[PDB]
Amino acid sequence: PRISVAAPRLDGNERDYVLECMDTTWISSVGRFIVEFEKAFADYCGVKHAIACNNGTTALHLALVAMGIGPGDEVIVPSLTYIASANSVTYCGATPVLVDNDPRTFNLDAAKLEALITPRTKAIMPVHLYGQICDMDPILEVARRHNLLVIEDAAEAVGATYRGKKSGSLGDCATFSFFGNKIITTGEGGMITTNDDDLAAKMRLLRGQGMDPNRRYWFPIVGFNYRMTNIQAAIGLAQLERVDEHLAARERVVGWYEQKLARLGNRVTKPHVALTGRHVFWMYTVRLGEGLSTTRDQVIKDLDALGIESRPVFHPMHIMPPYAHLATDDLKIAEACGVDGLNLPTHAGLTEADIDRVIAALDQVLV
Amino acid sequence: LPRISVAAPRLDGNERDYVLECMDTTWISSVGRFIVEFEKAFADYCGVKHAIACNNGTTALHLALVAMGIGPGDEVIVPSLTYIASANSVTYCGATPVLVDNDPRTFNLDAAKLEALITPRTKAIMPVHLYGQICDMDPILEVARRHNLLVIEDAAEAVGATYRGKKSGSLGDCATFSFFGNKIITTGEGGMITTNDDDLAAKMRLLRGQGMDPNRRYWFPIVGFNYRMTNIQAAIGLAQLERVDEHLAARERVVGWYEQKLARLGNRVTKPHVALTGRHVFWMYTVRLGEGLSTTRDQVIKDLDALGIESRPVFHPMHIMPPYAHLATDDLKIAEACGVDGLNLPTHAGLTEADIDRVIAALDQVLV
Ligand SMILES: C[C@H]1O[C@H](OP(=O)(O)OP(=O)(O)OC[C@H]2O[C@@H](n3cnc4c(=O)[nH]c(N)nc43)[C@H](O)[C@@H]2O)[C@@H](O)C[C@@H]1N
Ligand SMILES: C[C@H]1O[C@H](OP(=O)(O)OP(=O)(O)OC[C@H]2O[C@@H](n3cnc4c(=O)[nH]c(N)nc43)[C@H](O)[C@@H]2O)[C@@H](O)C[C@@H]1N
């Protein structure tokens, strides 16, 4: 049987809640679950406001637009990330300023921020890869000192914490994704968290085609159609109800990899865990050893043939066509990680036998 | 006394079943079989080669325009009388809309005002088939062709409509539809692009999927978007589309009722004119208030609401609102006249003959 790199576990009230939507006929972007989901997600992150959106990409765009990011502005974004992070900046007419990441946590290197600030910088986008929150204290300190905004792309870290705070409550705003491979899913769906009244209002106005609440077909600004549906919210609220279960499940999966690792010896380097809060392990990510004869890419092809799905750590932005014009000589760790990084199957339905197969496979494939 | 809504989804087919299927199979994201299935049924319905499912008709519009290469410094002719997504979608591209006036009877793009708005920057024209009625496509296509311009139909309100033998979605280079809750066919939130051009279609699909190389994980040749429709939306859409004919017949019957009963109102409303070019699907039955009335359009909508009946105004033309006031010209009068006197009456598959008598009775009481 095939082992998927990811998959949602719909073991709560998803089905009943969706049925209710169907049965009530509230299936569009108008229904109770949207507000309920938002209320509950806000409460779960300990922030005042949650804005449900259509996906974690339009969440990023919407948050940046509402923040006033536009032509001329610069936003610092790590090169090692999912493209939506830099794409969202480009949609605004703004310019991404790529920064290197840490070789252990894969995350934005705070020590490299300052050299990048210019008179055009407006925000910094820490991205919490693989379930692990960036070292926020120093990023916030650099930001404060420069009157910059911080937006967390927290799409891969729902439930993670940093020094007592949940992801989503640390920067001026944060975005999350609920695509089907994420910790909690809505199928496709996203959310923006923030504690700022103004920012939140602007986001809801923009999300809703920019229409004015009191005048039918009265639009004061150019908006977007970024609403989530009642059905996405229903699924979402149900998943959030079992969020701790979901998280305990990846902890079970990670515990299995962690205790079987020695069979791989120095052939992989295991995901390093910063001691700053909970690391949620959206994906259990290793760096293959410099010494193999095989290539990270061939490794994925071999595993596939072995019936196991896996993914590469992202290709850094500045090595791909859309962003090669942004390359600098100080993006070496991103390059290295993109080269040797591999996401192993990590989801709530994996059994210990699954994990045993993944380990056996790699033992065989890493030459 | 339950309220009569202007619109409402009629989920009287296999929507629930298909949707439970998605749940039971765990395929609820933009990965699942109903997507391709729906696209295929829809393309066949419209008589075209390709259908690209998207998360709403606004992003369908943006997607189509980026795929057609609309960009900064390009002009796209858009009617001022339309839903804002029409003009916003061009804006998203960094392109400039060039407003055109509409026909006073059909509410549609006035092809005779088209040629004059063409410049060195024009790249496309976007006819909008308001209210289920297809624009007079022949003359529009003749001008487009003569100046080598693309044509994108904004067919959101016209699923099922036909024009001189062809379905909406099949006349310009591409077309877009909306499956928002109040649409003829719904997916709650959803949209579609139709096209017979292989190239355009493939570009759309690449952009719609975050611009990722289908043969190279996390390798992106260009900047794309997250515009994919989910399996659940696609399941509702397929089921809806399965009963497209019943849905269009339900509406015809309602429109028949308005047609028969409106005489009780006399010259107090102007009944929507229907061109003999093809099938008018009546997403909304639209009247223009009598010029003779003492009352105002917004007052009539207020009075009906109070009477427990929902209604909507004909769209405020883009040039009169803040985001586009800068595009105003002195030749958008009919659009203005229409935004002033137009009213969409409740139009949907769940309305009964008694509901209509009630609506007509309310008009009789409030059109003073
Ligand atoms: C990190 C990147 O993940 C995704 O890319 P990718 O890794 O290529 O996604 P893919 O479509 O391949 O799905 C990832 C894994 O989750 C799976 N999957 C996604 N949606 C579903 C779902 O609704 N049901 C089930 N069962 N599996 C799902 C899928 O089959 C696969 O094994 C991007 O969409 C979002 C994100 N930025
Ligand atoms: C012309 C414009 O219509 C919409 O604007 P608006 O007229 O303000 O849509 P509204 O949210 O008022 O909904 C229209 C009617 O359909 C109803 N409706 C929408 N979605 C649903 C749904 O999922 N279920 C039910 N039963 N009714 C729905 C809603 O209650 C209302 O009576 C836009 O979102 C897109 C569109 N281009």
Nearest Cβ partner for B26 among A8, A83, A229: A8
Picking from A54, A188, A322, the nearest residue to B222 by CB comes out as A322
* Method for structure elucidation: X-ray
Specify the domain boundaries for CATH 3.90.1150.10 within chain A. 243-367
Token reading at B227: 């515009």
Kind and range of the H or E element at B178? strand B174-178
In this structure, which residue's CA is closest to atom 24 in ligand 1?
B27
- Residue in B223, B228, B321 closest to A219 by CB: B321
Each as own residue / partner, the long-range contacts of residues B297-303 (CB below 8 Å, 24 or more positions apart, any chain) are B297/B340, B297/B341, B297/B342, B297/B343, B299/B366, B300/B343, B300/B363, B300/B366, B300/B367, B301/A216, B301/B343, B303/B362, B303/B365, B303/B366
Residues 6+ apart with CB under 8 A from B275: B106, B133, B136
Closest among A175, A119, A114 to A143, alpha carbons compared: A114
Torsion on CA atoms A35, A40, A45, A50, rounded to nearest 10: 0
Residues of chain A found within 8 Å of residue B230, distances taken between Cβ atoms = 187-188, 232
**Best residue among A22, A30, A218 to mutate for probing ligand 2, ranked by most atoms within 8 Å of CB:** A30
Contact B84 A179 (CB under 8 A): no
Q: How many other C-beta atoms can be found within 10 angstroms of the C-beta atom of residue B249? A: 12
Ligand nearest to the backbone CA of B209:
1
Q: What secondary structure letter does DSSP report for B111? A: G
Q: Which long-range contacts (CB under 8 A, 24 or more apart) does B37-44 make?
A: B37/B234, B37/B238, B38/B229, B38/B234, B38/B235, B38/B237, B38/B238, B38/B241, B39/B192, B41/B238, B41/B241, B41/B242, B42/B192, B42/B194, B42/B237, B42/B241, B43/B194
Q: Which token pair is B50?
A: 């390709």
Considering only CB atoms, A187 lies closest to which of B57, B88, B232, namely B232
Q: Is the dihedral of CA A327, A328, A332, A334 positive or negative?
A: negative
Please enumerate in sequence order all residues whose Cβ is within 8 A of that of B6, keeping only pairs 6 or more positions apart, or say none: B182, B284, B310, B311, B312, B344, B345, B346, B347, B348
Q: Which residue of A has its CA nearest to B16?
A: A22
Mutate to test the pocket of ligand 1, among B22, B28, B29, B31 (most ligand atoms within 8 A of CB): B31
Return the half-sphere exposure (C-beta side, CA atoms, 13 A cut-off) of residue A298: 8
CA distance A133 to A288: 23
Query: Which residues are CB-contacts of B99 (< 8 A; sequence separation ≥ 6)?
Result: B77, B78, B79, B80, B87, B317, B318, B319, B324, B327, B328, B329, B332
The C-alpha torsion from B113 through B115 and B119 to B123, rounded to 10°, is 100
Contacts of B152 (CB under 8 A, 6+ apart): B61, B64, B65, B68, B124, B125, B126, B172, B173, B174, B175, B176
First to last CA, chain A: 25
Of all protein residues, the one whose alpha carbon is nearest to atom 21 of ligand 1 is A180
Instruction: Report the largest interatomic distance among the alpha carbons of chain A, rounded to a whole angstrom.
Output: 67
What's A243-367's CATH class? alpha beta
Q: Is the CB of A6 under 6 A from ligand 1?
A: yes
Peptide-bond breaks in chain B following residues (C–N over 2.5 A): none
Listed residue (B337, B283, B254) closest to B130, CA to CA: B283
Is residue A107 in contact with ligand 1, taking CB distance under 6 Å? Answer: no
What does the block give as tokens for B58?
A: 């606004």
What is A1-99+106-242's CATH topology? Aspartate Aminotransferase; domain 2 (3.40.640)
**Which CATH number describes the domain made up of B244-368?**
3.90.1150.10
**Tokens matching residue A8:** 């949602």
Amino acid type, B325 = A
Task: Provide φ and ψ at B282, rounded to 5°.
Answer: 55, 60
Residue nearest to atom 9 of ligand 2 (CA): B182
Residue reference for tokens 């190239």: B199
Give B-chain residues touching A18 at CB under 8 angstroms. Answer: 19-20, 23, 232
Distances (CA, A) of B178 to A218, B86, B233: 20, 12, 12
Question: Best interface-test mutation with A: which of B226, B297, B320 has the largest number of A CBs within 10 A?
Answer: B226
Which of A19, A93, A321 faces B222 most closely, judged by CB atoms?
A321
SS3 (DSSP) at B98 = strand
Reduce the DSSP state of residue B165 to 3 states and report it.
coil
d(CA B268, CA A339): 73
The whole-angstrom separation of Cα A220 and Cα A199 is 17
Nearest-atom number in ligand 2 for the CA of B188 is: 23
Q: Are B29 and A225 a contacting pair at CB < 8 A?
A: no
Three-state secondary structure along chain A? CCECCCCCCCCCCHHHHHHHHHHHCCCCCCCHHHHHHHHHHHHHHCCCEEEEECCHHHHHHHHHHHHCCCCCCEEEEECCCCCHHHHHHHHCCCEEEEECECCCCCCECHHHCHHHCCCCEEEECCECHHHCCCCHHHHHHHHHHCCCEEEEECCCCCCCEECCEECCCCCCEEEEECECCCCCCCECCEEEEECCHHHHHHHHHHHECCCCCCCCCCCCCCCCECCCCHHHHHHHHHHHHCHHHHHHHHHHHHHHHHHHHHHHHHHEECCCCCCCCCCCCCCEEEEECCCCCCCHHHHHHHHHHCCECCEECCCCHHHCCCCHHHCCCCCHHHHHHHHHEEEECCCCCCCHHHHHHHHHHHHHHCC
Residue B110 has which token pair? 């006035």
Cβ separation B58–A321 shorter than 8 A? no
Q: Which residues pair with B192 in a beta bridge?
A: B53, B177
User: Is ligand 2 within 6 A of the CB of residue B313?
Assistant: no
CA distance A191 to A200: 11
Please tell me what DSSP assigns to residue B192: E
- Residues paired with B285 in a beta bridge: B345
Residue of A nearest to B59 (CA): A225
Cβ of A211 closer than 6 Å to ligand 2, yes or no, is no
Contact between residue A247 and residue A279 where contact means Cβ atoms under 8 Å apart:
no
CA atoms within 13 A on the CB side of B212: 16
Contacts of A207 (CB under 8 A, 6+ apart): A51, A53, A62, A223, A224, A226, A227
The percent helix, strand, coil of chain B (3-state, each to 5) is 40, 15, 40
Residues forming CATH 3.40.640.10 domain(s) in chain A = 1-99+106-242
- C-alpha A150/C-alpha A278 separation (Å) is 21
In chain A, residues with a C-beta closer than 8 Å to the C-beta of B322 are 219-221
Ligand 1 neighbour B26 (Cβ under 6 A): yes
**Cβ atoms of A241 and A17 closer than 8 Å:** no
Chain region(s) in chain B for CATH 3.90.1150.10 = 244-368
Cβ atoms A160, A166 nearer than 8 A:
yes
Structure token digits, residue A70 = 């536009």
Provide CATH 3.40.640.10 ranges for chain B. Answer: 1-100+107-243
Q: Do A222 and B323 touch (CB under 8 A)?
A: yes
Q: Is the CB of A181 under 6 A from ligand 1?
A: yes
**Which amino acid type is present at position B106?**
T
**Integer Cα distance of B165 and B145 in angstroms:** 20
Residue type at position B358: R
Closest CA to A159 of A60, A34, A278, A271: A278
CA distance A359 to A353: 10
What tokens does B42 get? 């829809």
Q: H/E element holding B258?
A: helix B244-261
Query: A8 CB under 6 A from ligand 1?
Result: yes
The fold of the B1-100+107-243 domain, in CATH, is Aspartate Aminotransferase; domain 2 (3.40.640)
- Residue A309 to residue A322: CA distance in whole angstroms: 27
Q: Which of B20, B28, B89 to mutate to test the interface with A (most CBs of A within 10 A)?
A: B28
Q: Sort out which chain B residues have CB atoms less than 8 A from A221's CB and list them.
A: 322-323
